A paper describes a structure:
Prions, the causative agent of TSEs, are composed of polymeric fibrillar assemblies of misfolded host-encoded cellular prion protein (PrPC) that propagate by fiber elongation and fission. Biologically distinct prion strains can, however, be serially propagated in identical hosts expressing the same PrPC and produce different disease phenotypes. Rungs of the fibrils are composed of single PrP monomers that fold to create distinct N-terminal and C-terminal lobes with the N-linked glycans and glycosylphosphatidylinositol (GPI) anchor projecting from the C-terminal lobe. In this study, we determined the near-atomic resolution cryo-EM structure of infectious, ex vivo mouse prion fibrils from the ME7 prion strain and compared this with the RML fibril structure.
ME7 prion rods were purified to ~99% purity with respect to total protein from the brain of terminally infected C57Bl/6 mice. Mass spectrometry analyses (provided in a Source Data file) showed that PK N-terminally truncates PrP monomers in ME7 rods at the same site as in RML rods, leaving PrP subunits predominantly starting at residue 89 and extending to the C-terminus with intact GPI anchor. We determined a 2.6-Å-resolution structure of the single ME7 protofilament and found that the fold of its constituent PrP subunit closely resembles that of the RML protofilament, including the double-hairpin N-terminal lobe and a single-hairpin DS C-terminal lobe, with four additional C-terminal residues stabilized as part of the amyloid core in the ME7 fibril (94–229) compared to the RML fibril (94–225). Akin to the previously reported RML protofilaments, the ME7 protofilaments comprise a helical PIRIBS ribbon, where each two-lobed rib or rung is formed by a single PrP chain. The left-handed twist of the ME7 fibril is slightly slower than that of the RML fibril (approximately −0.54° versus −0.64° per rung, respectively), which results in a longer crossover distance (approximately 1,585 Å versus 1,344 Å, respectively). In each strain, the N180 glycan stems from the base of the C-terminal lobe and occupies the groove between the two lobes, which is significantly narrower and deeper in the ME7 fibril than that in the RML fibril (approximately 52 × 41.6 Å versus 67.3 × 34.4 Å, respectively). Considering the protein backbone, the widest dimension of the ME7 rung is shorter than that of RML (96 Å versus 107.5 Å, respectively) and falls between the first (T94) and the last (R229) residue of the amyloid core (one residue away from the GPI anchor), whereas that of RML falls between the first residue of the amyloid core (also T94) and N196 (the second glycosylation site). The tip of the first hairpin contains the Ala/Gly-rich sequence (A112–G130), which adopts a modestly different conformation in the two strains and is hereafter designated the conformationally variable (CV) region.
Numbering used by the authors:
A (entry chain C), B (entry chain A), C (entry chain B): 94 to 229
The structure:
Amino acid sequence: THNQWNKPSKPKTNLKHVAGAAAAGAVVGGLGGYMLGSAMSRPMIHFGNDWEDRYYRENMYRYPNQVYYRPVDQYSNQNNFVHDCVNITIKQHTVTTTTKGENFTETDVKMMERVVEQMCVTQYQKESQAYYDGRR
Amino acid sequence: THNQWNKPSKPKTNLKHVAGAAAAGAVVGGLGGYMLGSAMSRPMIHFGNDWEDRYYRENMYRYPNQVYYRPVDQYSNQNNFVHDCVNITIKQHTVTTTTKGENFTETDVKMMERVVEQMCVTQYQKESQAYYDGRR
Amino acid sequence: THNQWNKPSKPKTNLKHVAGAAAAGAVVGGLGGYMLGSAMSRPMIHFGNDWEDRYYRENMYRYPNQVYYRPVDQYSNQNNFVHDCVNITIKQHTVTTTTKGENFTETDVKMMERVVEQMCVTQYQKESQAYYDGRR
């Protein structure tokens, strides 16, 4: 004989942003031949009555990851790598408040001239040769 | 004999952004021959009576990942890589408030001249030769 | 003998953005021969009574992923890569408020001249030869 009763009264339940999996990653340049990991979300969430018996689950798992990097004659040049440039700013900022004023003069002057040439990420490369043969 | 009763009273239940799987990734340049991971979202959520018995599930799992990178003659040039450039800004900003004023003069003046040449991501490359043979 | 009763009272239930799978990925340049991961969303959400017995599911799973990168004579040039450029802005901004004013003068003056040449993503490449043979 097996009995299960579930009588919750006004069970307000919220599940926001639960069990999310995300496999990602940023790669700039490099010589390849690499492996990025996987993402697994496997939660068991239970409310109420759970009854289990005489089962056999989730056995004999294997996760063999192999990276075999065997180049023979590899010639490479890697120059001027950057990931990202964020929140570069130049500003002239004024905040003026006057709750109550009489017979007053306010003047705001903002000058910008020849402020900048480059703000970020200026990349220059002239002569790159992975293999150069200039004998004699 | 088996019995399952489920009598919740006003069970307000909310599930938002649950069990999402996202496989992604950004790659700039590189020499290839790589593997990015997968995303698995596998949650079990139960609100009530759960009864299981004499079952056999989720066995004999294998996840073999091989990256085999064997180039023989590889000549490569990689120059001037960037992922992204975000939130670059130049601004002249004024905020003026006058709740109550009499016989007043306000002046806002803004001049911008020759401010910038390149705000970001300027890439220049002149001479690249993966293999160069200039004998004699 | 088996019995299952499900008599919830006013069960307000909401499922929003549940069990979404998204396989994506951005690649700029590179030498190919890669593999991007997959997305699997496989949730089990149950309200009420669940009764399982003498079952056999989800066994003998294999996920063989192989990347085999074996070029022989690979010559390549990669120059001036960028993924994206976002939120580049130049602005002159003024916010003036006068809840109650009498006999006042307000002036807003904004000039822009020669402000910028390029905002972002300026790419220049002159001479690229994967294989160059200039013997004698």
